[PDB]
């Protein structure tokens, strides 16, 4: 029989044991199928279902686990069922089964559960961001481009700006699930079942939306796994953007936020020194999940039809990612929920370097003033403000007039950060009303997606 | 000004000139918007419009292109506009314009076209496959698992098994477009526009489905780029599967297909021999597109909000991925179309190695025979046949009965590759009727997607 | 204190426990250093040493392992140490120790062992290849480009062609180790130790070649791990090449090899139908390891100095890769060793399709006749042989002359695959003497690569 | 003929034209091979030499370039040669040449040059770092882990901490070149040349260190390309780290550095803003190069021997990488050299959060005082320093005596950041003497990588 190297190489129980409940459900469905085929009398159907539920309980509480001699979870569960109903009844269940459609189907079921757990996590992070946004709706911070100060924005607008990529990720999940909800059961080894089963029925009972249109493809294609891997990589990356922001904020130089004791690691001697370990692990993790994606794609590359053992490599890179997300998403959520914001710091740094010059110029542009004329007028205002070591609002009215008769005192409406953010009242702008509408639109969108994912 | 090294590093006119018609369209739309706001008189409206159509046609014909002094396509285009309507008169157009929402928007506008050219290529490959499948309604080949001869299948079933993944990728394109169809115009540099412009209308006239919900996210996020890159990599990978099958089939050892001279390379000295260079390039390319995706996701990783110069790296990997596909998709479509299938060779190899043994077992299985007994029976039948050196079919009833009385001569209905494939009449099975329904369905689905991508 | 999500996220005991022996070695050396600096009396050195040997032994036998409350291997190991020598003696070991240089050093040592193991495996595969190359010294197979029959080559030449890249990988291992052999001990957190210890001595005691030249870099940089990941991915890729060849050869259509039962999966109904599962797992895992490399590099990207928690992500990918190879390398080595070569099939296919014509053309070119002519001569020979149907060697001398006045009777020598492959008598050629010399050379090179790894 | 699609797909003249000079040197070597074979007339021979010189000058001036009908650089160059010496003197050079060793050899040579250009760039960046380090010998900044202030370090130490990885990369370059210096000339298409040439001689005249040992492997392997790709990716990542440091430093919040006008950029938002574009483009391009590496490895995966057209995809990613680095390395080197460090700001932030208390504890540990005792003492010291809002230095002698009698006034020695950094005198430590010695060692070692890369 098999050599030691081969046995050790092919063994998959350690990661694939998570497929057991799904394999059991599959065995139940196949039990009913065999009943409808005439290959199972009633006596036999009850025997098998009883054995499967007993095995299900024993798998749940932990009484049944894989042996070293077990190659995978399926061999393990057939072994257990045989141990519970004997070989004669047990062997009755193996009629009309193939492994190639089974591994694909089970991977799909598991994946459709996992993607929804991850979806829950994403909604947690979004919820934390939205809650902090609502808790701090008026705090103004310097908006950053090239990590340099641009226009002042509401803190809420920034946080929600981290919320939207995740909503997009949820959209990706919803879209992915539709391609995932296709049952390969009935495809046999590759050529299709000869048992005369009804693939639509089998598909319906196991929670799939439809049966596959092509057995060969149903058993050979793993693009659903690749798509999942991608979506998870994308979620990881967005999380890494948020993470980067929090890490930068947490620095003593920035001091935009102060970390919670429960949601960070602290120093033994330096009493108030806290490290953003959660954010950094998220950041570092994103690379990991990107790697899982690229690796999976490399594995699927140049695959001749139909099934090859290569495809057994589909699960572990996906699995891992999910695991990481299942660790990362709630953590980050808490990390976002626990943030304390130094709003005076942010309001101090928001109008620095005469940022608001921009707004001045823009105002002039709104007033029909030529664009260049407006901008050198702004430059003049800045030069005439660093004249007194003074703000732009503080500038004498004469100067507004001495630079341009177009500069009515009305401009002051945008020479303060409050007025600056209030002036941008277009859809998606950092204006209070717009940010509020955006926030509730986020609420409704989240509700729509979560509603869209129920089964 | 800028040092030579910086200028060399920042130059992008060698790849981004393909955005020119989109920048021009955006400039016309912004002319409308600015006029709507009253910041422009009619003479100017069509002054700028005339200048922009002049520039447009001179960009199409080739008269106007980037100079070495030009940094990007935008600087080039406004240099031209300035040359065509005056130096500051052209500077009027800058009113209410930022670069950050612009680069995102233009990338999107380019991408929604690129993805549809790619979609046309994919549909061409699907078309070729479907046609070869139809032109061989009865051709039977060995089904492959581990590149070993499994159950016999229709060649049509194989080719269509290469058609469905591409259909799924088309589905992915369709889904992606909904997220790509969001305009970031009005998002300014970071915070919203303060000009009182309507992002909705601007979105409508530029061909977008909606405007962005958050300015910061709209100018910072590049996940649509990552999604596009992924979809391209997926298409490339499925193409690599098709390519692998073709490279294997083209070997003298396989001889499943004979390549066309036009679509392959060969030696003058020995004319019969041909090399599947297109499939090989597809295979090698898939890795390159995978790499584009991976690299892009690494680039988007750990980006602090909002816009950073890092994001300029969003274009080139996607561009490449499109470029390559725009080369590979028709090429492949030619290859598949020009393939001559040696039907009798595949028909000959189909029942080899006593493959049909499996079918025998299955027949027994639906007669109500235990799974292991029905399989050893098959082993016995195969062993008896091997000594005789004859096919399983050319076996007298008395041996069928000496192996098992359950083996009535009826069993022979599935000992013929024709009866073998005929027996698998389940949905997505390789039975001629089911395959026919599948092919018609592939036509209807491809047509439906094609319809779904029109604007 | 720390939340459940943070504790769960931070927990690393499931993969990092393999660092325990190395940490205990580190604590040993550190104990010695501590004494000779004057920080420990000798009863305390005895105590600490004894505690560390006890803890080492119980870690080895398995009686001591990590609890669920243990965050990492270090927390566990000093938990055990404190349980074995008390908090006052154990707490005095912490003198002049920090996490950041420690973790880097431990990873380095572990990696220096792991790479060697992998090296042993690679040498095993190389050995199997050389063995088969010796066992088949005269077997001629058709050489493949584009998976198409090019010039005939010795089977030995092909197998050794698979041997050389692995030798290059071993070279990469030798080169890698030198950068790996740099102790970061004495670097502290980042600024260096203030205990007045000698980092070079500590380095020598733990098997390093030198101490780091910069503490900050020593604790921050993980380029050695990325390099390891690359060497592993390269090994995996070469293995995937070999694997591809074996998978194609094992196909019934090719029939170049027959698989061993103990080193493949097959059926018992169809006894001589065997699947090359090992090669396939190698193929997919190659993609996996590529993924690990790309991901790790993505994780190291945009890392601000010095140490970040991001770097904790350096181990799991690398680890994984090593694990994979440690399963793959013997398996492959077994597979190659177990292969049966159908020399008659390969030999029969070698001169097919007038392959040998190219050799004849080369011979004509050597005389010095025009290259176009010789080719001119050769195509002519091909069809004069085609219509008659005789092999190029079955053409009467007079016949050879009518199509070229240069074709002498002797030219027949390169018309047999033996003489043709012998004709290529140039270094690296497929001539028997040459392949023999390169085999001997492979032996010498392999056994020299081996020594440079012994410490 | 070849179809349009195939010709479009096969075209490589847009990227491979850089190989032309190498192709000419190769044609020269080949002319020598032919001369030695006596297949050429010495009059013919120098006819060919003159022709190839002419072609060389014609590539130099630019008068000769590729046409749209030319598929690759080799076709173009032989077309040119034919146009310069006639079709039958030029037709005679074709003798004994195949492209499969040609392309690999040319790629190898080009790579041996490109790797040295990159090398010079890296050395420039290192030199800039050393320059800045020497320019600031006593500057003290807050050491960072988790982007949080830890132990104070010299600015020079940080910059050099960025210098060392690049030195390692130069070492990787040195190691790589030795595997790159293996000539595949004489390997023919696959089985080796039959011309009776001396591969060693060709290898000598073309600048290689040795000739290949196996023709098949010499033509099929591309692991040199993969390794080059890796080295370039690694360099890009270290550069990404430096870049991240600078981007963060350039923030108004940090204010560690101020950017130079010629090595920085001005937003289109405000003119008084200077963004660090060079660093950001380095940061993203790092991801790009990672993508090139991963993609290349994916392409090389599952490649059956020998040459496949897949391998044509070896060049473009590698090329890309080189190009990117050739833009990045000087730029960065300028960026670093142009940096103005706000040393007083950093010095002000250095002793913050009572970080020096760490040092305090460490001092005690060095006195003979055990660990926990020392940290108890440090904690208490922080608690007093803390009540009056005073530094640990400010506290009077009596309070220190009270915390622990081991706190002789000698302790202040490390309560100043200067004495803090001066306590760390071990190799790699932030002690000025040690940092100086490190700098000198860096100088000579860099001069050693530069010596090693000169031929």
Q: Which residues pair with B258 in a beta bridge?
A: B340
Residues in chain D: 455
List the single residue in A277, A298, A382 with the smallest CB-CB distance to D298. A298
- Taking Cα atoms as reference points, which of D153, D426, D437, D378 lies closest to residue C33? D426
The answer to whether the Cβ–Cβ distance between C274 and B149 falls below 8 Å is: no
Work out whether strand C182-183 and strand C210-211 pair parallel, antiparallel, or are unpaired.
parallel
Residues of D identified as active-site? 146, 267
Count residue pairs from A and D with Cβ separation < 8 A: 115
**Burial degree of A265 (CB within 10 A; 0-12, 13-18, 19+):** middle
Give, in order, the Cα–Cα distances in Å from B291 to each of A380, A392, B93: 50, 50, 40
Q: Which residues pair with C154 in a beta bridge?
A: C140
Query: How many H-runs (helices) and E-runs (strands) does chain D carry?
Result: 19, 8
List the single residue in D39, D214, D414 with the smallest CB-CB distance to C164. D214
Residue C265: phi and psi, rounded to 5, are -110, 135
Cα A213 from Cα B192, distance rounded (Å): 48
**Burial degree of D447 (CB within 10 A; 0-12, 13-18, 19+):** exposed
Run of H or E including D14: helix D13-16
Q: Which two tokens stand for residue D44?
A: 């013919």
What secondary structure letter does DSSP report for D230? H
Give me the CATH topology for the region B352-423: Ribonucleotide Reductase Protein R1; domain 1 (1.10.40)
Determination technique used: X-ray
Return the C-alpha torsion angle C69, C73, C79, C82, nearest 10: -170
Contact C40, C52 (CB under 8 A): no
Cα B118 from Cα B114, distance rounded (Å): 6
Cα A75 from Cα A97, distance rounded (Å): 13
- Taking Cα atoms as reference points, which of D292, D264, D97 lies closest to residue D197? D97
Cα A455 from Cα A444, distance rounded (Å): 19
Cα D211 from Cα D199, distance rounded (Å): 6
Residue B268: phi and psi, rounded to 5, are -65, -40
Give, in order, the Cα–Cα distances in Å from D218 to each of C183, C362, C417, D199, D212: 38, 20, 22, 12, 6
The answer to whether the Cβ–Cβ distance between A354 and D272 falls below 8 Å is: yes
Q: Which two tokens stand for residue C303?
A: 């890392």
Of all residues in chain A, the one with the smallest CA distance to D381 is: A269
What secondary structure letter does DSSP report for A341? E
Half-sphere exposure of D124 (CA within 13 A, CB side): 19
Residue written as token pair 């007045």: C196
Residues in chain B: 455
Residue written as token pair 């092509």: A214
- Taking Cα atoms as reference points, which of B422, D151, B148 lies closest to residue C251? B148
Run of H or E including A440: helix A432-452
Cα A131 from Cα A149, distance rounded (Å): 25
Q: Looking at chain C, which residues constitute the CATH 1.10.40.30 domain(s)?
A: 352-423
Non-local (6+) Cβ contacts of A280 within 8 A are A243, A247, C308, C309, C310, D146
Residue A243 CB neighbour total at 10 angstroms: 30
Secondary structure class of C369 (helix, strand, coil) = coil
Contact C35, A361 (CB under 8 A): no
List the single residue in A145, A297, A363 with the smallest CB-CB distance to B306. A145
Q: Looking at chain A, which residues constitute the CATH 1.20.200.10 domain(s)?
A: 110-180+221-351+424-450
Angle of the C42-61 helix axis to the C20-37 helix axis, nearest 10: 180
Residues in chain C: 455
- Taking Cα atoms as reference points, which of C227, C212, C123, C230 lies closest to residue C177? C227
The answer to whether the Cβ–Cβ distance between B194 and A298 falls below 8 Å is: no
> What resolution does the deposited structure have, in angstroms?
2.8
Query: How many H-runs (helices) and E-runs (strands) does chain C carry?
Result: 18, 8
From chain D, pick out residues whose CB is under 8 angstroms from the CB of B9.
277-278, 281, 327-328, 331
Contact B265, B275 (CB under 8 A): yes
Where do the DSSP E strands lie in A304-446? 340-341
Non-local (6+) Cβ contacts of D368 within 8 A are C38, C39
Give, in order, the Cα–Cα distances in Å from D238 to each of A132, A287, D166: 36, 16, 7
Cα A185 from Cα A142, distance rounded (Å): 56
Count residue pairs from A and C with Cβ separation < 8 A: 166
Residue B149 CB neighbour total at 10 angstroms: 23
Residue written as token pair 């945009």: C302
Residue C148: phi and psi, rounded to 5, are -115, 150
**Burial degree of D336 (CB within 10 A; 0-12, 13-18, 19+):** buried
Contact C145, D189 (CB under 8 A): yes
The CA angle D405-D409-D412, to the nearest 5 degrees, is 120
The answer to whether the Cβ–Cβ distance between B292 and D294 falls below 8 Å is: no
List the single residue in A6, A294, A308 with the smallest CB-CB distance to C331. A6
Residue A344 CB neighbour total at 10 angstroms: 9
Non-local (6+) Cβ contacts of B443 within 8 A are B130
Say whether B267 is catalytic: yes
Residue D195: phi and psi, rounded to 5, are -75, -15
Cα D394 from Cα D373, distance rounded (Å): 22
From chain C, pick out residues whose CB is under 8 angstroms from the CB of A99.
none
Interface test mutation site (partner D, options B1, B2, B4, B6, max chain D beta carbons within 10 A):
B6
Non-local (6+) Cβ contacts of C243 within 8 A are C276, C278, C279, C280, C282, C283, C286, C332, D302
Q: Looking at chain B, which residues constitute the CATH 1.10.275.10 domain(s)?
A: 12-109+181-220
Cα D302 from Cα D307, distance rounded (Å): 12
Q: Which two tokens stand for residue B293?
A: 């995706």
Q: Which two tokens stand for residue C37?
A: 């600096």
The CA angle C59-C65-C68, to the nearest 5 degrees, is 160
Secondary structure class of A265 (helix, strand, coil) = strand
Q: Which residues of D188-204 are buried (b: 16+ CB within 10 A; e: fewer)?
A: bbbbbbbbebbbebbbe
The answer to whether the Cβ–Cβ distance between B237 and A297 falls below 8 Å is: yes
Give, in order, the Cα–Cα distances in Å from A198 to each of A32, A186, B358, B428, D423: 11, 7, 21, 11, 79
Give, in order, the Cα–Cα distances in Å from B71 to each of A372, B7, B9, B17, D375: 21, 7, 10, 11, 58
Residue D407 CB neighbour total at 10 angstroms: 23
- Taking Cα atoms as reference points, which of C427, B3, B111 lies closest to residue D188? C427
CA distance C15 to chain A (A): 13
Of all residues in chain A, the one with the smallest CA distance to B213 is: A428
SS (H, E, C) chain B: CCCHHHHHHHCCCCCHHHHHHHHHHHHHHHHHHHHHCCCCCHHHHHHHHHHHHHHHHHHHCCCCCCCCCCCCHHHHHHHHHHHHHCCCCHHHHHCCCCCHHHHHHHHHHHHHHHHHHHHHHHHHHHHHHHHHHHCCCCCEEEEEECCEEEEEEEHHHHHHHHHHHHHHHHHHHHHHHHHHCEECCCCCCCCCCCCCCCHHHHHHHCCCCEECCCHHHHHHCCHHHHHHHHHHHHHHHHHHHHHHHHHHHCCCCCCCEECCCCCCEECCCCCCCEECHHHHHHHHHHHHHHHHHHHHHHHHCCCCCCCCHHHHHHHHHHHHHHHHHHHHHHHHHHHHHHCEECHHHHHHHCCHHHCCHHHHHHHHHCCCCCCCHHHHHHHHHHHHHHHHCCCCCCCCHHHHHHHCCCCCHHHHHHCCHHHHHHHCCCCCCCCHHHHHHHHHHHHHHHHHHHHHCCC
The CA angle B21-B26-B32, to the nearest 5 degrees, is 130
Half-sphere exposure of B299 (CA within 13 A, CB side): 37
Residue C256: phi and psi, rounded to 5, are -70, -35
Return the C-alpha torsion angle C197, C200, C204, C207, nearest 10: 110
Contact A139, A153 (CB under 8 A): no
The answer to whether the Cβ–Cβ distance between A296 and C287 falls below 8 Å is: yes
Where do the DSSP E strands lie in D239-368? 257-258, 265-266, 274-275, 340-341
- Taking Cα atoms as reference points, which of C343, C363, C70 lies closest to residue D39? C363
Cα A44 from Cα C133, distance rounded (Å): 57
The answer to whether the Cβ–Cβ distance between A269 and D145 falls below 8 Å is: no
Q: Which two tokens stand for residue A239?
A: 């999380």
From chain D, pick out residues whose CB is under 8 angstroms from the CB of A354.
272
Give, in order, the Cα–Cα distances in Å from C130 to each of C125, C203, D170, D306: 9, 39, 35, 18
Contact A285, A332 (CB under 8 A): no
Of all residues in chain B, the one with the smallest CA distance to A91 is: B371
Q: Report DSSP letters for C412-428, one per residue.
A: GGGGSHHHHHHH--STT
CA distance C67 to chain D (A): 25
Cα C265 from Cα C275, distance rounded (Å): 5
Cα D131 from Cα D128, distance rounded (Å): 5
User: Which chains form contacts with chain B, at 3 or more CB pairs under 8 Å?
Assistant: A, C, D
Say which CATH architecture domain D110-180+221-351+424-450 belongs to: Up-down Bundle (1.20)
Residue D297 CB neighbour total at 10 angstroms: 34
Does domain D12-109+181-220 sit in CATH 3.40.50.2300? no
Residues of A identified as active-site? 146, 267
Interface test mutation site (partner C, options B144, B259, B270, max chain C beta carbons within 10 A):
B270
Would you call the peptide bond into D306 cis, given omega within 30 degrees of 0 as the criterion? yes
Express the helix, strand and coil content of chain A in percent, nearest 5 each: 65, 5, 30
What secondary structure letter does DSSP report for A185? T
Q: Which two tokens stand for residue A304?
A: 């001749």
List the single residue in B247, B250, B382 with the smallest CB-CB distance to C270. B382
Query: What sign has the CA pseudo-torsion B410, B414, B415, B416?
Result: positive
Contact B318, B111 (CB under 8 A): yes
Contact D434, C192 (CB under 8 A): yes
């Amino acid at each position: 029989g098999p050599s030691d190297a081969l046995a050790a190489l092919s063994k998959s129980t350690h990661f694939d044991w998570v497929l057991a409940p799904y394999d059991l459900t599959a065995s139940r469905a196949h039990t009913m199928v065999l009943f409808r085929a005439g290959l199972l009398t009633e006596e036999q159907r009850d025997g098998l279902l009883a054995g499967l539920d007993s095995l299900a309980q024993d798998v749940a509480d932990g009484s049944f686990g894989p042996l070293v001699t077990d190659e995978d979870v399926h061999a393990a569960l057939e072994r257990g069922l045989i141990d519970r109903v004997g070989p004669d009844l047990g062997g009755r269940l193996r009629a009309g089964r193939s492994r190639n459609d089974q591994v694909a189907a089970l991977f799909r079921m598991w994946l459709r559960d996992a993607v929804r757990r991850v979806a829950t996590g994403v909604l947690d992070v979004v919820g934390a961001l939205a809650e902090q946004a609502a808790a701090h709706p008026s705090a103004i911070m310097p908006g950053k481009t090239h990590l340099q100060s641009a226009q002042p924005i509401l803190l809420a607008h920034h946080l929600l700006a981290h919320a939207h990529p995740l909503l997009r990720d949820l959209d990706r999940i919803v879209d992915f699930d539709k391609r995932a909800a296709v049952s390969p059961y009935g495809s046999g080894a590759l050529a299709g079942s000869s048992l005369g089963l009804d693939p639509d029925a089998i598909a319906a009972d196991l929670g799939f939306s439809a049966a596959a249109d092509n057995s060969v493809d149903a058993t050979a294609a793993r693009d659903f796994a690749a798509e999942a891997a991608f979506v998870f990589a994308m979620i990881a990356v967005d999380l890494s953007r948020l993470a980067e922001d929090i890490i930068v904020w947490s620095s003593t130089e920035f001091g935009y936020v102060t970390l919670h004791d429960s949601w960070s690691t602290g120093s033994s001697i330096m009493p108030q020194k806290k490290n953003p370990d959660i954010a950094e692990l998220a950041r570092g993790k994103s690379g990991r999940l990107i790697g899982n994606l690229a690796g999976l794609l490399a594995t699927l590359k140049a695959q001749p039809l139909a099934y090859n053992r290569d495809l057994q490599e589909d699960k572990e890179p996906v699995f891992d990612s999910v695991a990481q997300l299942e660790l990362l998403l709630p953590a980050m959520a808490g990390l976002v929920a626990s943030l304390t914001f130094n709003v005076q710091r942010m309001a101090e740094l928001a109008p620095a370097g005469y940022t608001l010059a921009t707004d001045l110029a823009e105002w002039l542009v709104r007033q029909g003033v030529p664009f260049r004329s407006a901008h050198e007028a702004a430059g003049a205002a800045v030069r005439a403000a660093e004249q007194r070591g003074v703000g732009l609002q503080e500038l004498t009215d004469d100067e507004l007039a001495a630079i341009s008769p177009e500069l009515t005192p009305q401009v002051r409406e945008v020479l303060t950060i409050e007025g600056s953010v209030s002036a941008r009242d277009c859809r998606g702008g950092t204006a209070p009303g717009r940010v509020a509408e955006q926030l509730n639109a986020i609420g409704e969108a989240a509700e729509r997606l979560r509603r869209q994912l129920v089964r």
